[PDB]
């Protein structure tokens, strides 16, 4: 909960690539 949820989901989209 320390991170911003809306920032995590944007970067997991980048790690998939």
């Amino acid at each position: 909960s320390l991170w911003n949820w809306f920032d995590i989901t944007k970067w997991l989209w980048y790690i998939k690539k």
Partner: antibody
Framework: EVRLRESGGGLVKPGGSLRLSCSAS????????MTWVRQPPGKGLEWVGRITGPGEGWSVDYAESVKGRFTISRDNTKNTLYLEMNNVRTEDTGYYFC??????????????????????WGQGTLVIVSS | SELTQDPAVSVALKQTVTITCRGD??????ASWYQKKPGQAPVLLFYGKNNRPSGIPDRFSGSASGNRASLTITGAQAEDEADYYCSSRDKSGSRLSVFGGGTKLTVLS
């Protein structure tokens, strides 16, 4: 163990004001996202808005049919959620629910910002708007 | 109302009927399902890709393909008669949520 209590409903003329309260207990309320959902009588559910947690700056997202009129705020020391209603129109009549909002985001097939699902629901409070 | 859904669907007792929820945002986001009985709080039935909350009968199940999300009731019973709703993002990448019109599932018992 999760319990949600809506209260503060009643009668109001169009253009009036009102404040709704959802006291929560059972979970960790400081981190849990909370959502208001309204239901016109004889109609379907309608997403009013949600409030986020600490890691998100407590940001709030509103419905366009509601933007500028209602406000969502939370008091973590009382475990209560608030839905301020100003310039209340006749279309705001209905049962309003507060729901514990869960966050979902599949790592392999998801898409940001993921999805949101409403785990635990309250039994709602009735708001009637008429002239 | 980005999620389109059947208004009324009928089912014979102890048969299988699937409720369909359609929306352009369903091509990128999963859908969650809710049971709404008259005068009772909604109950989360299904969410995510394949997540059923405990305390829910295993006859509920979900499916998705393209812009279509589907809830499946295998062998519908009398208590299964209620209003069912879908929910997901209103748009791809949007921070807003939205429900569907709703399905009145009538069980012929």
């Amino acid at each position: 163990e999760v319990r949600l209590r809506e209260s503060g409903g009643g009668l109001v003329k169009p253009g009036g004001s009102l404040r709704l309260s959802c006291s929560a207990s059972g979970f960790d309320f400081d981190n849990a996202w909370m959502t208001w959902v309204r239901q016109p009588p004889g109609k379907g559910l309608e997403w009013v808005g949600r409030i986020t947690g600490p890691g998100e700056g407590w940001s709030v997202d509103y419905a366009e049919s509601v933007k500028g009129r209602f406000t969502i705020s939370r008091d973590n020391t009382k475990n209560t959620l608030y839905l301020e209603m100003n310039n209340v129109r006749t279309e705001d009549t209905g049962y309003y629910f507060c729901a514990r909002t869960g966050k979902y985001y599949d790592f392999w097939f998801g898409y940001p910002p993921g999805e949101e699902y409403f785990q635990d629901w309250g039994q709602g409070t009735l708001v009637i708007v008429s002239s | 109302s980005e999620l389109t859904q059947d208004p009324a669907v009928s089912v014979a007792l102890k048969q299988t009927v699937t409720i369909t929820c359609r929306g352009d945002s369903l091509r990128s986001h999963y859908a969650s399902w809710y049971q709404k009985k008259p005068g009772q709080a909604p109950v989360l039935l299904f969410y995510g890709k394949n997540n059923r909350p405990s305390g829910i009968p295993d006859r509920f199940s979900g499916s998705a393909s393209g812009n279509r999300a589907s809830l499946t009731i295998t062998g519908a019973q009398a208590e299964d008669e209620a209003d069912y709703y879908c929910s997901s993002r209103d748009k791809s990448g949007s921070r807003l949520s939205v429900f569907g019109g709703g399905t009145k599932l009538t069980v012929l018992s």
